[PDB]
């Protein structure tokens, strides 16, 4: 009597974990019996029993639909679930494009600071005034009655580092960055560049507001000259899409565009007009006071002695951007590790700056 | 009171056996579909709400492409897309938007998860797990060695020093000078010494007939590198990966440019890794194709020193 | 420059459908599975007249060897 109770609890707990797992495997079997689901879109509704579907078990078909399904689900032009031999409409669901996370790679708006390679500050302020203000009020623009921006272009030498200037910006605006890497848009398949861009653009309008950041367009850059269609047909395919969105009845309603270009010369004649690329901003080479600031923000986290004449280094230095000064700072820091001190001197900076200058174009 | 106890111990033993029989049955079932021919497929979209999507069309005349895919998709390699509802036979969170899955061509369900990465694992990626070179056995190369040792090897180890300073390491190195000096020999000696994997990439190899293929190849190279950590990616060329033209008409040569740009952005896109070390070399003496302004780009400069008579003697 | 807007403008007033046709998304690299959806599309438009057929940027399909680097 006594013994039985004691044994009973041990075997019951053991058996329960085993019975439960096993029971799941049985559910899985039930599923292998279950029928496959073919994807279709309805072209049109013929009769209450006949539908046009263009399926992918075979070709175009006229198909049936279950008499268990609602009339309210019949809606004009929708995505449908089809069977794989009965060829009937299992379900209806409302047509949106599929969302893209395989084409939307996420870079968070605050993995950096705009006081890191700040001192590029001034260009940040001009990009902010264009972009940032529409997001806060359309109302202010509206009273006057004036069309606001859609797109902005940054071009020039990537002395900031092309991507860095932009990335710093993304952080400040704190919005929904839909990121584009240009050479994943180009593919070796038919009509994928066209399909991809379009869906991507579609997703932005539902989801609005959103910024589409295009980094280094040069897969869009190329007006041809030998008038090929070698690879060159794809160049034409993509370019045409960019213009088609603008030429449309679409309005980038709260949709923002930022473009990056290394050298500008392959722009279209329709971009000069606003209503695609409104604003095109240049790089600007820092003033010595900016330069001091940039050197100062770099020097500040890292270890040092107790006395550095900042201005002297400012003098030697010219023709650099914030990324370009940063390297000199770190360069000085290597020489200190060599010297085995956490203590720097004026000399390391003088030499560092000259070392970088020579190496340069 | 006595009775109920003793029957419950017999009940529990009987229940285990019926459930035990069920699992047995499932095991054979799954196994049969594995024996090849078998369909591997690629999951494009993870998602598990909003079914239905579309593939294929009718005909007549006038040509514009279209393709779609949603809920969860697998695209099998006859180029067919399939809608499945998830199973616990493998977990969907463990799966990704871009994963290879093993599918049971019956109900079209994911029996299993396969490893990481798709398509080519580079069409000619040479791995040298331990090079046969040592630099302690060749003297008179000495000047170049002193600079090389100091450049690569020192950040990994000496990390503790770096951390206290607060400066970060490099990531790329440039070597320039007359080819065929046995510049490469020293690169192979450092790799042997350090305990990184040496990955040899040749620049015309990235170039393909196929359109956009190279960028995938480089991205993959980078990804394989991440897994291997540490690694040396040795890039031969800065001529077939060091041109991009500044010519106005340059469009035809777009392929070459796209790949080069891809490397530079792949470097600029994020903030460094201490899993990769990259060494770049020229193969024709000196070009200008900017790729050296940041240190997430290249920043270290190694020069070949002109021949010293003393050095030649030592080699002899 | 509004070259496009005038076209739409006459269409809106006149009482006939706007059909917007992409002529450089006619272009394709090889036959396969992809371009056959628009096949059915044009023919219905002819049937249920009136309509305005506007073809945007025909040229992708129109460049052929007349330069002889195509």
Return the residue matching tokens 């009509």: A191
Residue A67, exposed/middle/buried by CB under 10 A (0-12, 13-18, 19+)? exposed
Distance CA A155, CA A264 (A): 7
Structure tokens at A242: 């960019």
C22, C25, C34, C53: best to mutate for the B interface, most B CBs within 10 A = C34
SS3 B144: helix
Structure tokens at B205: 């190899």
Distance CA A198, CA B68 (A): 12
Q: What residues are paired with A80 via a beta bridge?
A: A92, B53
Residue C46, exposed/middle/buried by CB under 10 A (0-12, 13-18, 19+)? exposed
Distance CA A254, CA A345 (A): 52
Distance CA C26, CA C42 (A): 13
> How many interface pairs between B and C have CB atoms less than 8 angstroms apart?
46
User: Residue A8's closest CA among B8, B170, B250, B107?
Assistant: B8
SS3 B312: helix
Type and span of the H or E element at B80: strand B80-83
Distance CA A27, CA B88 (A): 10
User: Residue B110's closest CA among B129, B87, B134?
Assistant: B87
CB contact under 8 A, C26 and B79: no
Peptide bond into B37 cis (omega under 30): yes
User: Residue B46's closest CA among B71, B69, B67, B68?
Assistant: B71
CB contact under 8 A, C34 and B65: yes
Experimental method: cryo-EM
User: In which order are the strands placed within the sheet that holds A151-155?
Assistant: A177-181, A210-215, A255-261, A151-155, A277-281
Distance CA B175, CA A24 (A): 61
Phi, psi of A80 (to 5 degrees): -140, 150
Phi, psi of A102 (to 5 degrees): -95, -25
Q: Is A161 annotated as a binding residue?
A: yes
Type and span of the H or E element at B200: strand B197-202
Distance CA A32, CA A53 (A): 26
Q: Is C2 annotated as a binding residue?
A: yes
Q: Is B177 annotated as a binding residue?
A: yes
Question: Judging by DSSP bridges, how do beta strands B172-176 and B126-128 pair with one another?
Answer: unpaired
A268-274 long-range CB contacts below 8 Å, 24 or more apart?
A268/A223, A268/A239, A268/A243, A270/A243, A270/A246, A270/C1, A273/C1, A274/A147, A274/A149, A274/A150
Distance CA A323, CA A164 (A): 9
Q: Is B183 annotated as a binding residue?
A: yes
Phi, psi of C22 (to 5 degrees): -95, 110
Are the CB atoms for B186 and B148 separated by under 8 Å?
Answer: yes
User: Residue B66's closest CA among A309, A344, A39, A312?
Assistant: A39
Task: Write out chain C residues lying below 8 Å of B61, CB-based.
Answer: 39, 42-43
Distance CA B96, CA B124 (A): 27
CA B109 to chain centre: 28
SS3 B233: strand
| DSSP type of residue C32 | S
Structure tokens at B26: 């499932």
Question: Judging by DSSP bridges, how do beta strands B39-43 and B99-104 pair with one another?
Answer: antiparallel
Task: Write out chain B residues lying below 8 Å of A96, CB-based.
Answer: 50
Q: What angle do CA A49, A54, A56 make, to 5 degrees?
A: 120
Type and span of the H or E element at B10: helix B2-34
Task: Write out chain A residues lying below 8 Å of B167, CB-based.
Answer: 302, 329-330, 333-334
Phi, psi of A96 (to 5 degrees): -135, 160
Structure tokens at B45: 């979209």
Extended beta strands in B214-258, E state: 231-236
Distance CA A18, CA B16 (A): 7
Structure tokens at A55: 């399926």
| DSSP type of residue B266 | H
Task: Write out chain B residues lying below 8 Å of C28, CB-based.
Answer: 63, 65
C37 at A interface, C-beta within 8 A: yes
Q: Which of A228, A234, A240 sits opposite C57 (nearest CB)?
A: A240
C60 at A interface, C-beta within 8 A: yes
A231 at C interface, C-beta within 8 A: no
Distance CA B47, CA B66 (A): 21
Peptide bond into C50 cis (omega under 30): yes
Structure tokens at A238: 């993509």
Binding partners of B (≥3 Cβ pairs within 8 A): A, C
C45 at B interface, C-beta within 8 A: no
DSSP per-residue codes, B86-115: --SSS-TTTS-SSEEEEEETTTTEEEEE--
Q: What angle do CA B241, A178, A283 make, to 5 degrees?
A: 60
Structure tokens at A331: 């360069």
User: For chain A, after which residues does the C atom lie more than 2.5 Å from the next written residue's N, i.e. where is it broken?
Assistant: none
Phi, psi of B173 (to 5 degrees): -130, 150
Task: Write out chain C residues lying below 8 Å of A44, CB-based.
Answer: none
Binding partners of A (≥3 Cβ pairs within 8 A): B, C
Distance CA B103, CA B251 (A): 43
First-last CA distance in chain B: 100
Type and span of the H or E element at B73: strand B73-76
Task: Write out chain A residues lying below 8 Å of B63, CB-based.
Answer: none
| DSSP type of residue B251 | G
Residues belonging to chain B with any Cβ–Cβ distance to chain C shorter than 8 Å = 56-67, 79
Q: How far is CA B108 from CA A278, A299, B69, B103, in A?
A: 49, 59, 15, 6
Are the CB atoms for A39 and B52 separated by under 8 Å?
Answer: yes
Q: Under 8 Å CB-to-CB from A203, ≥6 apart: which residues?
A: A97, A99, A100, A104, A178
Are the CB atoms for A259 and A211 separated by under 8 Å?
Answer: no
CB contact under 8 A, C22 and A273: no
Give how far B60 is from chain C: nearest CA, Å: 5
A319 at C interface, C-beta within 8 A: no
| DSSP type of residue B306 | P
Distance CA B238, CA B289 (A): 8
Structure tokens at B143: 């000047």
Type and span of the H or E element at B127: strand B126-128
| DSSP collapsed to 3 states, chain A | CHHHHHHHHHHHHHHHHHHHHHHHHHHHHHHHHCCCEEEEEEEEECCCCCEEEECCCCCEEEEEECCCCCCCCCCCCCEEEEECCCCEEEEEECCCCCCCCCCCCCCCCCCCCCCCCCCCHHHHHHHHHHHHHHHHCCHHHHHHCCCCCCEEEEECCCCCCHHHHHHHHHHHHCCCEEEEEHHHHCCCCCCHHHHHHHHHHHHHHHHCCEEEEEECCCCCCCCCCCCCCCCHHHHHHHHHHHHHHHHCCCCCCCEEEEEEECCCCCCCCCCCCCCCEEEEECCCCCCHHHHHHHHHHHHCCCCCCCCCCHHHHHHHCCCCCHHHHHHHHHHHHHHHHHHCCCCCCHHHHHHHHHHHHHHCC
CA B188 to chain centre: 21
Q: Is B179 annotated as a binding residue?
A: yes
Please, what's the b/e burial string for C5-35 (b: 16 or more CB within 10 A of its CB; e: otherwise)?
eeebeebeeeeeeeeebbbbbbbbbeeeebb
Q: What angle do CA A211, A231, B75 make, to 5 degrees?
A: 65
Torsion of CA A14, A15, A19, A22, to 10 degrees: 60
Q: What residues are paired with B198 via a beta bridge?
A: B128, B232
Q: How far is CA C68 from CA A61, A222, A227, A229, in A?
A: 43, 19, 9, 11
Q: Is C63 annotated as a binding residue?
A: no
Resolution (A): 6.8
């Amino acid at each position: 009597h006594k013994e039985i109770d004691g044994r009973l609890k041990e075997l019951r707990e053991q058996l329960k974990e085993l019975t439960k797992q096993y029971e799941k495997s049985e559910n899985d079997l039930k599923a292998l019996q279950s029928v496959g689901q073919i994807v279709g879109e309805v072209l049109k509704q013929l009769t209450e029993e006949k539908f046009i579907v263009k399926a992918t078990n075979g070709p175009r078909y006229v198909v049936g639909c279950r008499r268990q399904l609602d009339k309210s689900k019949l809606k004009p032009g929708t995505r449908v679930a089809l069977d794989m031999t009965t060829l009937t409409i299992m379900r209806y669901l409302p047509r949106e494009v599929d969302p893209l996370v395989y084409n939307m790679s996420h870079e968070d708006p605050g993995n950096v600071s705009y006081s890191e390679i700040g001192g590029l500050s001034e260009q940040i302020r001009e990009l902010r005034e264009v972009i940032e203000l529409p997001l806060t009020n359309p109302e202010l623009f509206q009273r006057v009655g004036i069309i606001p921006p859609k797109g902005c272009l940054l071009y020039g030498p990537p002395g900031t580092g092309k991507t860095l200037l932009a990335r710093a910006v993304a952080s400040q605006l704190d919005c929904n960055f839909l990121k584009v890497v240009s050479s994943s848009i180009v593919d070796k398949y038919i009509g994928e560049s066209a399909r991809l861009i379009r869906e991507m653009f579609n997703y932005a309008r539902d989801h609005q507001p959103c910024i589409i950041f295009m980094d280094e367009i040069d897969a869009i850059g190329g007006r041809r000259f030998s008038e090929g269609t070698s690879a060159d047909r794809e160049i034409q395919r993509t370019l045409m899409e960019l213009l088609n969105q603008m030429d449309g009845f679409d309005t980038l309603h709260r949709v923002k565009m930022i473009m990056a270009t290394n050298r500008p010369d392959t722009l279209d004649p329709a971009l000069l007009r606003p209503g695609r690329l409104d604003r095109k901003i240049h790089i600007d080479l820092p003033n010595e006071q900016a330069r001091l600031d940039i050197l100062k923000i770099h020097a500040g986290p890292i270890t040092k002695h107790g006395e550095i004449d900042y201005e002297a280094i400012v003098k030697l230095s010219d023709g650099f951007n914030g990324a370009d000064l940063r390297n000199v700072c770190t360069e000085a820091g290597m020489f200190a590790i060599r010297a085995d001190h956490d203590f720097v001197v004026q000399e390391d900076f003088m030499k560092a700056v000259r070392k970088v200058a020579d190496s340069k174009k | 009171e006595i009775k109920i106890m003793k029957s419950e111990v017999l009940r529990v033993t009987h229940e285990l056996q019926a459930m035990k029989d069920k699992i047995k049955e499932n095991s054979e079932k799954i196994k049969v579909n594995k024996t090849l021919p078998y369909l591997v497929s690629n999951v494009i979209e993870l998602l598990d709400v909003d079914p239905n999507d579309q593939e294929e069309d009718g005909a007549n005349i006038d040509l514009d492409s279209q393709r779609k895919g949603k809920c969860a998709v697998i695209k099998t390699s006859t180029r067919q897309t399939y809608f499945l509802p998830v199973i616990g036979l493998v977990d969907a969170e463990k799966l990704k938007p871009g994963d290879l899955v093993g599918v049971n061509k019956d109900s079209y369900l994911i029996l299993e998860t396969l490893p990481t990465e798709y398509d080519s694992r580079v069409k000619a990626m040479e791995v040298d797990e331990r090079p046969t070179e040592q630099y302690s056995d060749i003297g008179g190369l000495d000047k170049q060695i002193q600079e090389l040792v100091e450049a690569i090897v020192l950040p990994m180890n000496h990390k503790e020093k770096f951390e206290n300073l607060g400066i970060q390491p490099p990531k790329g190195v440039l070597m320039y000078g007359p080819p065929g000096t046995g510049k490469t020999l020293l690169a192979r000696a450092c790799a042997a010494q350090t305990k990184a994997t040496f990955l040899k990439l040749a620049g015309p190899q990235l170039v393909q007939m196929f359109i956009g293929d190279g960028a995938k190849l480089v991205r993959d190279a980078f990804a394989l590198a991440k897994e291997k950590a540490p690694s040396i990616i040795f890039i031969d060329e800065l001529d077939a990966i060091g041109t991009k033209r500044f010519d106005s008409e340059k469009a035809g040569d777009r392929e070459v440019q796209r790949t080069m740009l891809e490397l530079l952005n792949q470097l600029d896109g994020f903030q460094p890794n201490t899993q990769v070390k990259v060494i770049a070399a020229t193969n024709r003496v000196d070009i200008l194709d900017p790729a050296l302004l940041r240190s997430g780009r290249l920043d270290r400069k190694i020069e070949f020193p002109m021949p010293n008579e003393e050095a030649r003697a030592r080699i002899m | 420059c509004g070259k496009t807007m005038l076209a739409k403008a006459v269409a809106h007033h006149t009482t006939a459908a706007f059909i917007r046709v992409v002529g450089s998304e006619f272009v394709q690299k090889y036959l396969g599975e992809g371009p056959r959806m628009v096949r059915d599309v044009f023919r219905l438009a002819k049937e249920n007249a009136p309509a305005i057929i506007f073809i945007d940027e025909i040229d992708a399909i129109a460049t052929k060897r007349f330069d002889a680097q195509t």
